[PDB]
Design a protein around this ligand. Structure first.
Ligand code: MG
Length: 274
């Protein structure tokens, strides 16, 4: 019933919760539109959405309470072969979750599951967009350079301006992805677009070969569900090198078009893929 979580199955053991489903590069379609080294690689934002969705369904609270994911680590990428289904599983005990995948033919052998992401979930009962006066980032040149990594469903930044290591971007879903607001807590395409604003700032100064990949996130909090359009403020932490870096860290704040805070991301940790 969630496009990535699948369905909740009976608790495998007392106090242990579990969701399982099947995905492929064709469904959700955006899972087939991100590549690294010519392999289809599931975007890390997929795991953040699964965790937010699990928080909403497992943890108590008013519907309007904020959804929280903390201490996220991405352990192993999920590589899809075009059109071949993969079993996905999110398991939870207490506040901690794990996301694994398996070949459907081997999904009953517990040792056939590869761990992709882990963290903690929480729920809590319920800053402004700066006037940056930035320099416009030319997005067409960015998209054309990044098209070896990203397909046309994942080019959702409309405007981006920078000043120092900060930027404000306007991201808006379109096409099928804008029609799916009822399906996700925060559409992976929208959050990926916000993270790509960080990429656009980085790649002004260093190469997009061996591209940066999200490996961790200290905290993400979501205050409104089903958002299709935001302005995002991002701040890159001071880099270790002015030439070429293996890692970056960024904080982000997402606002609706009225300036109300929709989501906040603390210490997104990026590392170049080997
Ligand atoms: Mg990724």
């Amino acid at each position: 019933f969630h496009p990535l979580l699948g369905r909740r199955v009976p608790d495998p053991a007392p106090g242990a919760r579990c969701f399982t489903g099947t995905v492929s590069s064709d469904r959700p379609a955006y899972l087939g539109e991100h590549w690294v080294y010519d392999a289809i690689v599931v975007l890390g934002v997929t795991y953040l959405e699964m965790a937010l969705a699990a928080a909403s369904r497992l943890l108590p609270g008013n519907a309007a309470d904020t959804l929280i994911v903390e201490d996220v680590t991405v352990w192993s990428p999920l590589v899809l072969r075009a059109g071949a289904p993969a079993r996905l599983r999110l398991r939870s005990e207490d506040e901690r979750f794990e996301i694994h995948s398996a070949e459907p033919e081997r999904s009953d052998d517990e040792s056939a599951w590869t761990r992709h992401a882990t963290g903690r979930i929480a729920r809590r009962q319920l800053g402004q967009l700066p006037r940056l006066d930035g320099e416009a980032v030319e997005l067409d040149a960015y998209y054309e350079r990044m098209r070896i990594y990203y397909g046309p469903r994942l080019r959702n930044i409309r405007h981006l301006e920078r000043r120092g290591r900060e930027a404000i971007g306007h991201v808006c879903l379109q096409g099928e992805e804008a029609q799916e607001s009822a399906s996700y807590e925060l559409h992976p395409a929208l959050l990926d677009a916000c993270f790509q604003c960080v990429f656009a700032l980085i790649y002004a100064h260093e190469s997009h070969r061996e591209p940066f990949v999200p490996l961790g996130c200290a905290r993400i909090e979501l205050r409104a569900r089903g958002v299709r359009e935001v302005r995002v403020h991002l701040r890159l932490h001071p880099p270790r090198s002015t030439d070429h870096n293996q890692t970056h860290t960024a904080d982000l704040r997402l606002f609706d078009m009225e300036g109300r805070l929709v989501a906040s991301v603390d210490a997104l940790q990026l590392k170049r893929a080997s």
